[PDB]
Symmetry: D2
Subunit: 406 residues, 4 copies
């Protein structure tokens, strides 16, 4: 009845009675998946074992032997079922967008922390990870840098995940500021995407256990969001933050005075936990998986595991849309229309919902604290593709739609 889906896929990769391993790997990579994709491990484990047998071809039987455990995911890849079918074409566009933004040399590397915010201004990296796990990187995408305020969406998602929308917003608002004292009309910080809200959010997570276990908890959570790619910690940055955090201590003592914390909070300990979270290191590549988890409804696209509740992800994307780019948030929301969160190390965590996640990193910031190259890339991207939140999917004038074939 059914010519096995393995056999079907074998005769679309051949046409020619055996398939060399290199030709299978090359074709796989042209789909956008990496050979290292964790959902492909059994297939790659079977390829490693078959290759050990001789100093290397593949009949229909050996092909079924290697692909049968992952045949569904491989088929969607090879039959152009992914969110961006023509990924190689899309990748060329990202590279042009990267090169155009590389010429933008304005901005100043933040210097308030000595601790390696002596980063080179020429550092510039862009990483893409689609909701189906297709990957592309250009530039300095393996270099660790601190999330800084890029961590704010992530830890708010964690808190809404563990505690729910209602409890979290007992303590922090859900709206942009006004031209920004610290607290809105209900004497809550305005939203989780500014320092006061992030500090209150930090006090909500894993209450009860000590700070060392809270950090372990958040790290394990970030690991799931990144599909177990690079997450780390900059103790140097942490020490800088805690010695130069005069504004944050002011916020902390103010929040404590206005009774903004859940009962039982040690505010100075929370501030320390806050500085730790800002000092978490990612790379562009690992951070883009984190964004793609947000783009994919809370499922990590390269592992398939449910990481956040959909309520946590919708809420996070909403507040990233309106509050994520500091004083530029209103203009960014209007011209780019994408959930994004910037950080003072030069990172912009960018989310194209249902499509892809991205991390852009260039240390030189503009006057509002946003990476100059990153802001430029974001504008170009949406000017090229119909990814703006309120672009139309049918009628989009000169823009390109990478979700489509023609």
């Amino acid at each position: 009845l059914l010519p096995s889906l393995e056999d079907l896929l074998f005769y679309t990769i051949a046409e020619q009675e055996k398939i060399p391993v290199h030709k299978f790997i090359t074709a796989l990579k042209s789909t956008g998946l990496r050979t290292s994709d964790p959902r492909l491990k059994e297939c790659m484990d079977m390829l490693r074992l078959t290759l050990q047998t001789t100093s290397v071809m593949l009949d229909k039987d050996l092909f079924k032997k290697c692909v049968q455990s992952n045949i569904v995911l491989l088929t969607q890849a090879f039959r152009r079922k992914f969110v961006i079918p023509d990924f190689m074409s899309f990748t060329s566009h990202i590279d042009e967008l990267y090169e155009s933004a590389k010429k933008q040399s304005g901005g100043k590397v933040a210097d308030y922390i000595p601790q390696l915010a002596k980063f080179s201004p020429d550092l510039w990296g862009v990483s893409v990870c689609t909701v189906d796990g297709q990957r592309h990187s250009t530039g300095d995408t393996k270099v660790p840098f601190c999330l800084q305020s890029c961590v704010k969406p992530l830890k708010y998602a964690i808190a809404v995940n563990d505690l729910g929308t209602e409890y979290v917003h007992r303590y922090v608002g859900k709206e942009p500021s006004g031209l920004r004292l610290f607290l809105n009309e209900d004497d809550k910080p305005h939203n989780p995407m500014v320092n006061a809200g992030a500090i209150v959010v930090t006090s909500l997570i894993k209450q009860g256990v000590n700070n060392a276990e809270k950090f372990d908890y958040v790290m394990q959570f970030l690991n799931k969001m990144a599909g177990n790619e690079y997450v780390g910690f900059s103790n140097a940055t942490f020490q800088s933050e805690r010695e130069s955090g005069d504004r944050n201590f002011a916020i902390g003592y103010y929040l404590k005075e206005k009774k903004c914390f859940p009962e039982g909070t040690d505010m100075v300990g929370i501030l320390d936990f806050y500085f730790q979270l800002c000092s978490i290191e990612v790379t562009c590549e690992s951070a883009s998986v984190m964004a793609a988890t947000l783009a994919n409804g809370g499922f990590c696209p390269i592992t398939g595991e449910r990481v956040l509740s959909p309520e946590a992800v919708r809420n996070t994307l909403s507040l990233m849309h309106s509050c994520g780019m500091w004083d530029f948030s209103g203009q960014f929301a209007f011209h780019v229309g994408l959930p994004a969160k910037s950080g003072v190390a030069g990172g912009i965590l960018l989310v194209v919902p249902n499509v892809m996640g991205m991390m852009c990193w260039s240390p030189p910031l503009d006057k509002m604290g946003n990476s100059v190259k990153g802001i430029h890339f974001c504008h170009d991207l949406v000017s090229l593709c119909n990814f703006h939140n309120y672009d139309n999917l049918r009628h989009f004038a000169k823009k390109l739609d990478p979700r489509r074939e023609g």
Copy 2:
């Protein structure tokens, strides 16, 4: 090789002839209306065919004679290619949401003018027009009422269409205020508040007189509504102009702050502004206007291009963040849909790529938003993965009407 009309014919038959009522009943179940302008040739031919009797049955060749001219649309309709395939199931959910909000009898009918205070608190209508022209109304959806601030996205869309983003926003901002009148640049905060709308009004069709400015807008609103009802309440306009002290304060303040293009007659612009607020619609015709905004600027029941994609994207963005007065931030967070409320009780609602809607009930909550409409919008999104930041693949237990199963 075999004809599209025949394939469609063989789908509706099973049975060498299709009864006419069978064809019509199947067509309406898709959600298209018999009166759809894109179906006029089909329906005229059906009407003419029945006159020249010879019975009431359509064989293959007669079927081809009738549907030939609109075959593409009739097939997208019949092959379940529309944005909401199981439209009748969705329709029944709309009615449920309608009946829930009907019971929310709270709020106060606006009474700063006699025309608004006249309206019964119990008038409540909801109308739906998808981006493919599928229609559904429940309640008081053929009762005329004034757009009031619901016109503000529409005239801004007209301004961006004729003038572009960069020009228009020399005069008006693009953010919620959070709080007045002017932002840090001495511009009104956004086009969705009186000060910004008054300035947007002064950008439209500069040079010509007010009668021609108005007719230019009315003809524009007619295209957005697929030529359904757009009218004018002179009674409301006269009351607006004699009780709008606040609006006169804004207008003089704008003139003092030099907020208008050079050559503006501010009191004339205020008059034009009051006229735009007094334009009348029904839920049904306003829902087509919203659907045009849902459909990238093409009117879904006529196929006509009305607005630039740029105008539509801008308007949706500012409706999202600024369209529900002091509730805008909470609406964006919990509903996540572009919407615009007005003091007559209307909420102009857009679900991008899906549909436009108009909800109307005169009683307002103390933020100025129709109580029944606010309740309906929350219910709608609690039920369907329509929130701007819902996910289209993983959406918990929400219903997705774009799908079949």
Copy 3:
């Protein structure tokens, strides 16, 4: 025992040991006290001197009989003048300081004549006048002190004083606040912040003489300013009034906003009140007549050159308090701290200035600084308090090196 008459006592002081006093010698001695022979309180004495001067061809010598005859009806005021009982006893010396202060402020030629209406733009920037009227009626002017100009916002304390005079403190402040704003139309009770800014002045205007028409209201205020000015010059610039009404978009915005917020007494015709407000801004004074108005405020509401009670002590105290904190636009806080005098500036370049218990002054020069205050006048105010212990919180017993013109040596 009995009485050697006060008239004869005074005659001997003026008659330096001689038999008769020539009339010119009496006038010169009188003028040296600071009083003007035209002082309304001295009219009988001057009438009698004029009658005596009629009997003779040229000049007359006054014996004690003729002296008592001319002087008897005003002998008390004349005795205080001549026995140095006036608030500034050595007025000639003080007058020389005012002239020095005047001359050095004359050199401050910066600022910009207001030009939002043509009438204000036409005034030359070198017009500069300063006039002093003490609470005892001693007068001094230097510069362009008889040139009419519009009170503009300088009228704001005056109509507020009229409203408190007629209506009381509690009623008036149902409608307007009593504090400086800081940073925009209404305070937290939805009242204009104070009567010294446009919104509060417009509301104050709607409180005065309600129920009669605008023409009768203006006559009423005009008569009131005449009393405050001791019947010196008060007028009206219809040209300024017309330009104000056609140019004041900000004031129309304010009036529509106040109407919206229900800031007016019930029954107010708001555009009619705006018209009345433009009229009040267009009232004309000179430095000399305006200094008498200031001196009425310095003197607890008694006009010092007529002795008539013009305003209640309550109206005057309220007015001086709000001029102190709110009278110099955005510069009020600095002016209160460094000058410490109730003052009120206007866009024509006037600064109505009060030294309570001492004197009133009008300084006028059209060129304004970026805050709307006359450059020369502001310079003069600072100099005056650098020189004399007139600051609100200068101490009257220990004031270090400042002069105190109230004291003899």
Copy 4:
């Protein structure tokens, strides 16, 4: 030309010898206290004369001269009704009536944010007067120690301006009411020295360079001069509680440091400590009234004659007390009362009637704006009765009475 001693002697012995009690009784009726530091030589010689009895309790012209000669100028001013309030006993009667009227105002809440303030009885109420000539009057609980709290804010600003001048001090602090927490005005300075942010900055200007123990002693020595060496103490219990519960003040201090509002070389956390100490300095109504009298008298302490503050310091302090001294009530207090005043959370109101007298009113129960209810009531009543409003007129003042005039 007869001698001032003899002239005064005749004025008192209407008749060849004055009894001592008669001299003392007439002296106290001028309002001067027999303990006045300016009268010590007179008082010392009087008691020494009583020891060597002889004549009895009777003073002749030569004994009177021996006793009063060293203080004759002051005693003559007193006895010849030349003090600023000549009929002091009558004025005293009015103060008493005003006191009793405010005593019936039992509203308000004692501050409870630290236990030291919470333990004070609501019914404590005292009012003390010291004129610029040293005339003294007290009614109620005027010998009960309480903390200055924010009443110290004008006193340390006055010290700062005295030592450093107006221009330097106001590089760091503004000179106007705020009207609109905010913390900072447009120039990124605290609005004025009468609010916590400005006071904290002013605290950081005094005796820069020396340690906090020496800064504190410098200030205490300064307050003791203002108070004519009457009680100035310290509540370490209040200080401990202040620093343990001053979250808001730590917020301000870190914000101030973030915005670079301190002089360079400032240890903000140590300045916060010094600030809590200044708030914990103790006075009584009687000694605090002398402090306010010093401000009333252009910087001279009226019961010692000592120059304590420059006139510049005093004028600045009185100006900012006028417009900024009663928290959110400042604008209304300036309009209706028109007197320089400073309230504090322990119930004190430091009150200055310039050229006339200083006062301290104290009652712990505060109103919703932080001001003592009985004290606010007394200040209104005082100015309703007397032409002491800054913009009252000294010649035409309606039905008010002027205690400076005789009739």
